[model samples]
Target: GITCDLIGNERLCVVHCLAKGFRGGWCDSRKVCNCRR
Candidate 1:
């Protein structure tokens, strides 16, 4: 998978993961997506 620094204050990549069917949260100082089924 792509290890993107896709999470932040105004940029919610958790929802980006959710939209892709994964439950995701922030890791690495809220810079990466810790996503799983």
Candidate 2:
């Protein structure tokens, strides 16, 4: 397991990664969200 957590702005990274086709996300105040595809 990758213990070192990557802290980033979720909503921001979603838009950013989606645009780059990375599918990466983090930091969800309302709920836990993740992207890895």
Report the number of the highest-lDDT candidate. 1
1-37: candidate 1 lDDT, tens digit per residue: 4354543432365566677777654445545556563
lDDT of 2 by residue, 1-37 (tens): 2111334544555655576676675644544444454
**Global lDDT of model 1:** 0.53
Best by TM-score: 1
Structural similarity to truth (TM-score) of each candidate: 0.40, 0.32
Cα error, candidate 1, residue 2 (Å): 10
Pairs with backbone N, CA or C atoms under 3 Å apart (clashes), candidate 2? none
